Amino acid sequence: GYFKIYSKHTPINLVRDLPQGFSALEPLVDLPIGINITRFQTLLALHRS
Amino acid sequence: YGFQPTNGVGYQPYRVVVLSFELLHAPATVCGPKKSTNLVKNKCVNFNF
Numbered sequence: 435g436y437f438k439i440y441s442k443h444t445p446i447n448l449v450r451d452l453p454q455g456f457s458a459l460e461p462l463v464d465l466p467i468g469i470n471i472t473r474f475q476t477l478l479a480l481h482r483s
Numbered sequence: 484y485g486f487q488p489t490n491g492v493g494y495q496p497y498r499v500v501v502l503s504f505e506l507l508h509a510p511a512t513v514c515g516p517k518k519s520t521n522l523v524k525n526k527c528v529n530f531n532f
């Protein structure tokens with residue numbers, strides 16, 4: 435019933451390709467929800483201007 | 484109820500609040516408060532952090 439989220443923000447010196455290296459992720463959040471999960475999605479900001 | 488200020492007790496309005504604690508099957512939730520005392524130093528002590 436806890437939804438844990440770890441995260442890390444590293445700066446690449448590329449724009450959009452997966453690099454190589456080691457970087458450990460530090461815990462961010464903890465939510466005592468109870469929710470069941472089986473699926474997920476993503477959200478994007480369109481092109482309009 | 485036509486309540487009026489010159490009513491004998493037992494006909495005057497009473498406000499009621501009913502607290503109902505429930506325990507479904509989650510991981511945890513709200514509870515009483517905690518009381519932290521003073522923290523000594525340099526003495527064999529029995530501690531709880």
Ligand SMILES: *[C@@H]1O[C@H](CO)[C@@H](O)[C@H](O)[C@H]1NC(C)=O
Nearest residue numbers: 435467468469470471508509
């Ligand atoms: C999540 O789904 C399963 C389906 O097998 C169900 O048995 C379970 O009770 C659900 N989780 C909760 C917390 O109810």
